[PDB]
Paper text:
We identify a highly abundant classical pre-translocation intermediate with eukaryotic elongation factor 1a ([name]) in an extended conformation, suggesting that [name] may remain associated with the ribosome after GTP hydrolysis during proofreading. Next, we observe a highly abundant intermediate (33%) that has not been described previously: whereas the tRNA is accommodated in the canonical A-site and the SSU ‘rolls’ into the classical pre-configuration, [name] is bound to the ribosome in an extended conformation, which matches crystal structures of purified [name]–GDP26 and its bacterial homologue EF-Tu–GDP27. To analyse the pre+ state at higher resolution, we rapidly isolated soluble ribosomes and imaged them with cryo-EM single-particle analysis (SPA). Approximately 30% of particles were in the pre+ state, yielding a focused reconstruction of [name] with specific side chains of domain 3 (approximately 3.5 Å resolution) unambiguously identifying [name]. In the classical pre+ state, [name] domains 1 and 3 interact with the sarcin–ricin loop (SRL) of the 28S rRNA, whereas domain 2 blocks the A/T site and contacts the A-site tRNA. In a model of the human elongation cycle, we propose that the classical pre+ state may follow the decoding state, in which [name] still adopts a compact conformation. Although we cannot rule out that other factors observed at this site in situ could have been displaced by [name] during the purification, the occurrence of the [name] bound classical pre+ state in purified samples indicates the possibility that [name] may remain bound to the ribosome during conformational switching to the extended form. The functional relevance of a possible [name]-bound classical pre+ state remains to be further investigated with complementary methods.
Numbering used by the authors: 4 to 445
The structure:
Amino acid sequence: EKTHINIVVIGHVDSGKSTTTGHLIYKCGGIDKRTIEKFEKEAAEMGKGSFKYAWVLDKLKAERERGITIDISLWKFETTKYYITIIDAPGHRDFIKNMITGTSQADCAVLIVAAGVGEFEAGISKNGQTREHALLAYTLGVKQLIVGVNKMDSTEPAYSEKRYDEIVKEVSAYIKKIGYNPATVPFVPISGWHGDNMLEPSPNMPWFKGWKVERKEGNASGVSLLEALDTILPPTRPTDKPLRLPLQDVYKIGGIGTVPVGRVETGILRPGMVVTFAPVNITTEVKSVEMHHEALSEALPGDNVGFNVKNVSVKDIRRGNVCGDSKSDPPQEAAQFTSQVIILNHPGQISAGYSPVIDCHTAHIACKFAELKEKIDRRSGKKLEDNPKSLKSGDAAIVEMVPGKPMCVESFSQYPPLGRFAVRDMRQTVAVGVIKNVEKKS
RNA sequence: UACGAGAG
């Protein structure tokens, strides 16, 4: 009955994602040896070469393409604490689409960092995808990160302490820069080919006394990688964050008054709160909250409640408004926001000034594509062109949007229910993306 | 699961 966890394996090409994942699957005992050899021989027949530990993640990537799904029972294995399933990994056509749309959602990210001579340098170079992948993971809101320092068996001396520390520190400063505190990240020197250190201390690694992570939830320490997968925590509702409540409708009930209606996305709504409506900037008091024809002392995330407010007319507040706590991170109007989008099937080309309608939470406002900033490869997330001339179907890009009318939006990392939007033109959804940063208006 | 950018 162990709770389930979704894993995405990110990292630079040839850094050892597939090998590490496949060897982990082998050691975890999720697949019997006979079936393992059968699938190894199948892979050898399909492609020329040796696919030992490589057929697992490569097969997963190949089965996440062109909407063909036969079986996913192979990539489900059991740790001591959880049942963990490999979902997706970079290196296929639909990776970015699955990441942005959420069809492939992951609770924790396993960054495999190649660590031998020349590898750790290349992975973080201009052409390296390590930085791209970590930035994408942070953008998507995957705040739990595992760093596998892989193929370490290749230094001189064979397992260098200072090479490990070099990678660790130069990674740690950079992700302190982007937003992961290095203390919560477990670092483990491994070689996916050797199966080094995966489930028990490696005899080749006497100096690696163990890994230690310092988290707000408490410190944890270990040696092997299985324990790293055992450090993960379950998914949960945001019932401690500030209040956020998109307005779906506002009604005028005879003998009661104005009664906005919507679903609580984060935080708590209770009677007596002083609430602020954005972007209209209207502050009032909640007279009462009703759900299931009963008076509710508090409204939890997910509760679609209707609450009565005083001194506010129905013409004052409307659909698309975001309601929040007036004295705890209150909602505010968005002057502009920067988002990363992937262009779906579009009748033509997208240029600067393109102004489609944006559907964010319950809002429906036309936003102008002010600037076409960057063009991103949809296959690996690698930056291809800066300031592209135009965008077509299949192009991933980062653009700046200016709402044509007052709009209230949030970033995907902080308030996921209000950070993802859909771009629709005519009857077609031409693009879907997530918001990175928002410039709150005065 | 159909439907949906997602919640559902």
